[PDB]
Symmetry: C2
Subunit: 36 residues, 2 copies
């Protein structure tokens, strides 16, 4: 599956936290075998 996303840091702009959130969602969906 996808490799584990890198956390962009506490001080990242909101746009980058949103990007990380989306990548983390995808990662967790694959790890849990639930790609919906």
């Amino acid at each position: 599956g996808p490799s584990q996303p890198t956390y962009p840091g506490d001080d990242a702009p909101v746009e980058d936290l949103i990007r990380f959130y989306n990548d983390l969602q995808q990662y967790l969906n694959v790890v849990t075998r639930h790609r919906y």
Copy 2:
């Protein structure tokens, strides 16, 4: 709004990454003024 969640670390168990994901979602919804 809620304070910014603390990242639990790359090596956290999946359950804790899910918990962080949910807390981050709530945080981002409030920051973007879109609590749906």
